[PDB]
């Protein structure tokens, strides 16, 4: 079945420009008339994409090309076909592309669309073939020479049958067929878009977002792919199986996905009608900064510049031990409210998710941290204070509140960061005949400081004569019993109340998570969140040699410069991957496309460390400019650059800088 084709000629590789093609819907969220910013694997605008063509040029030893080479897959592929006679028939994806590994085949064999994930012995020169029969003028599918064997097939889909037009056509290419292929978490994602065209070469400029086509659960590694094309045989192609063939005109183009940040416009029907590639050029940077497709004239420094980050790293001290929260909450006996029981929690990995998701808790109210944000915040001490009170008093356990319980039994600070759980305990903690095992302090001469336990037996003086410590008249014992009964009202029913205080210090992380750590890389512009401190930049091995039991150092501007990861205890240094705050000067997009770039606090000799570098630079004490041209004329300030420098779009027509 495998045949190595001959008679190909040599031709240098060709390239073209992708314009603004290749945008696809990155999710399935229901939208209408909104702009949305997202970092995902996209084809950069105006990329040099590779151009491949199946043709047979007229003349003696005319160029004869049938392009089906192996290509890398990397992080995903944008593919575009310009067709008239349907030469491109599909693809194969894999790593070895032999029976040693599994491979994916997506091929349209003129009767069906076939998708198969199997161990394939693919041919070195795989192809499909159509035969033209002169006598009845019929173009019929004749050859299928993709693989020589298929074993351990694990996925198979065959579409409903059809009969496709296989005729070799005359004229210009008439259909553009675009695909975006991704391999994410074992799922092969296919997005596609079909467009009528009329051209001989290149790609159309019109914008069209690709619509997600299919999501295949195949779970295979993909690093390489090959295009499957259909050739032609007829009485006009004498020769053997290797040489008796010709190529019907067709072209295809390959561009490569990479992590890019796009601003996408969703219209009233949710269709992506336009997009901005933030890192294409400063104008796109301004548009992404202002969250708008239209930007008015002015000077903006917050636009800055981004090479973007590559990957994210999460690190925490490696602790797997389970916390005893379940043991504490499921205990049989507790202390009283005046003797609130305190347990310290340290050296553990947390599981608050199940506690929050539990439906057996009457009141679960938190201050300082939201339950969703709690999983990603990292603590050094946990304090669990447990007691039991009647249901109506539960509302008194809250910051900045008064009442006998708050004043005399348990206090909370006005700057409390922590959360409170309380839930009904009528059956377990109440019984007939009264309960004298839970009491409360009702009478004392002052309030309590926050987090202060007291079990004093000082006899309260309620009259005008000292008791001297002996029970008498108007002489009250400070503690009184609730006397819970199971037949009373809901307000009198006992309730278990616990408070979790998340004590944060400047100390090594102790109990945090639950989230798995990730391998560490350096010398790359990445996102990171060390112990709950989040940043974007490049991590380098630099030494400041600070103190033991220190975690971060700060500059004058109060931004983190040094970090100490837990699993290594290494002194990493943070460097911003930008060139600093760079200012853009614009006269408005709807008026002109020329812009000026001011590198504040930057010399013109550092700029080279899209305008690549200085070509005609004016230097002021405010910085370097590349777009504005000096004139000896003086005019009223229109856009004040600063330091006596003002700019405007004036005479030719260009942005010029002047000094009144």
């Amino acid at each position, epitope marked *: 079945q495998c045949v190595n084709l001959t008679t190909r000629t040599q031709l240098p590789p060709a390239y073209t420009n992708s314009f603004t093609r290749g945008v696809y819907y990155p999710d399935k969220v229901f939208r209408s008339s909104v702009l949305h910013s997202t970092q995902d694997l996209f084809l950069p605008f105006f990329s040099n994409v590779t151009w491949f063509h199946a043709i047979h040029v007229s003349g003696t030893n005319g160029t004869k090309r049938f392009d089906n080479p192996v290509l890398p897959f990397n992080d995903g592929v944008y593919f575009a076909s310009t067709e008239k006679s349907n030469i491109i028939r599909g693809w194969i994806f894999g790593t070895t592309l032999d029976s040693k590994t599994q491979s994916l085949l997506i091929v349209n064999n003129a009767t069906n669309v076939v998708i198969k994930v199997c161990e394939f012995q693919f041919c070195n020169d795989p192809f499909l073939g159509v035969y033209y029969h002169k006598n009845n003028k019929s173009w019929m599918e004749s050859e299928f020479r993709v693989y020589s064997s298929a074993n351990n097939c694990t996925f198979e889909y065959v579409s409903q049958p059809f009969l496709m037009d296989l005729e070799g056509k005359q004229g210009n290419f008439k259909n553009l067929r675009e695909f975006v292929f991704k391999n994410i978490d074992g799922y092969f994602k296919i997005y596609s878009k079909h467009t009528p065209i009329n051209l001989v070469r290149d790609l159309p400029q019109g914008f069209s977002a690709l619509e997600p086509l299919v999501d295949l659960p195949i779970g295979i590694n993909i690093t390489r792919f090959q295009t499957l094309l259909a050739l032609h045989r007829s009485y006009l192609t004498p020769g053997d199986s290797s040489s008796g063939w010709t190529a019907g005109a067709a072209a295809y183009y390959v561009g490569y996905l990479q992590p890019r940040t796009f601003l996408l416009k969703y219209n009233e029907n949710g269709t992506i009608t336009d997009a901005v590639d933030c890192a294409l050029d400063p104008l796109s940077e301004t548009k992404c900064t202002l969250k708008s497709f239209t930007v008015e004239k002015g000077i903006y420094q917050t636009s800055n510049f981004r090479v973007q980050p590559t990957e994210s790293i999460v690190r925490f001290p490696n602790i797997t031990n389970l916390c005893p929260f379940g043991e504490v909450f499921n205990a049989t006996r507790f202390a009283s409210v005046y003797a609130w029981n305190r347990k310290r929690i340290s050296n553990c990995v947390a599981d608050y998710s199940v506690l929050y998701n539990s439906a057996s808790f009457s009141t679960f109210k938190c201050y300082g941290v939201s339950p969703t944000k709690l999983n990603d915040l990292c603590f050094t001490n946990v304090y669990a204070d447990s007691f039991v009170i009647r249901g109506d008093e539960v509302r008194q356990i809250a910051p900045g509140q008064t009442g006998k319980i708050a004043d005399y039994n348990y206090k909370l600070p006005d700057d409390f960061t922590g959360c409170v759980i309380a839930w009904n305990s009528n059956n377990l903690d109440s019984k007939v005949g009264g309960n004298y095992n839970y009491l409360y302090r009702l009478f004392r001469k002052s309030n309590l400081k926050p987090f202060e336990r007291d079990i004093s037996t000082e006899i309260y003086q309620a009259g005008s004569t000292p008791c001297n410590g002996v029970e008498g008249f108007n002489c009250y014992f400070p503690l009184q019993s609730y006397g819970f009964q199971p037949t009373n009202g809901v307000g009198y029913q006992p309730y278990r109340v616990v408070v979790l205080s998340f004590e944060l210090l400047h100390a090594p992380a102790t109990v945090c998570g639950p989230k798995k750590s990730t391998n560490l890389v350096k010398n790359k512009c990445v996102n990171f969140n060390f112990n709950g401190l989040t940043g974007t930049g490049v991590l380098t091995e630099s030494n*400041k*040699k*600070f103190l*033991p039991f220190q975690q971060f150092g*700060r500059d004058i501007a109060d931004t983190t410069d040094a970090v100490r990861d837990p699993q290594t*205890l290494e002194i990493l240094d943070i460097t911003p991957c930008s060139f600093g705050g760079v200012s853009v000067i614009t006269p408005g997009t709807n008026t002109s496309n020329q812009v000026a770039v001011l590198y504040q606090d930057v010399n013109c000799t550092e700029v080279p460390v899209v305008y690549s570098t200085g070509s005609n630079v004016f230097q002021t004490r405010a910085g370097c400019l590349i777009g504005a041209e000096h004139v000896n004329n003086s005019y009223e300030c229109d856009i004040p650059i600063g330091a006596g420098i003002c700019a405007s779009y004036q005479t030719s027509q260009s942005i010029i800088a002047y000094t009144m």
Partner: antibody
Amino acid sequence: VQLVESGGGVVQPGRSLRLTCAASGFIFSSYGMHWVRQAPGKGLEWVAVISYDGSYKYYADSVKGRFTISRDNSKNTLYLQMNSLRAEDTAVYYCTKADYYDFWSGYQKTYYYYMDVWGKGTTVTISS
Amino acid sequence: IQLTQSPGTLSLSPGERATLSCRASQSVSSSYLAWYQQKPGQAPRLLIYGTSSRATGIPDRFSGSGSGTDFTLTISRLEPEDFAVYYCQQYGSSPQITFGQGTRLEIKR
């Protein structure tokens, strides 16, 4: 490399004083600082610590929350405010820099911490 | 954390071995320790850190050993410049580091 202390003298019990420490011969923005005192005819005693930038300042529990430490990197100067001064603090004060020897281990970073250079120090006398 | 020294006082003649002991009330790592000296009316100077290494510019006679909670400083030969007070210090089990009590190492005749 050396350091100098200044501000010592005579103070009534209950007043406030500012001790100053200066350094010369090394980069002042790459190391922390310790204040350690010695009582007359007694052993050494920890007082205070300040990091390189001013984001970590602990204190000894015996003087917890009383003394305040500060530094100015530009002038290469270190200031110590004494508030709520007691009559026990009559002693000698030394300002010193922290240093450590680095060692690599299996996926670890071991530090041998110590103090290397000590100034002549300044005396403080507390009597009514 | 606090430490204790042994002996309370020491008096030996020049040219013999000297041994000082530092004991802990709580387990510490044997790489987190140091030994300093102090002669009267002079700033204290580093002698040993890490119980196994030496500081720059100090002769070989100073040495250290020990682990757990028992630590030992050793001197082979004694010259007139070794006659001063000695301190043992932990500086890695932080905060609130503490020093030793103080040993006088004088001459007996």
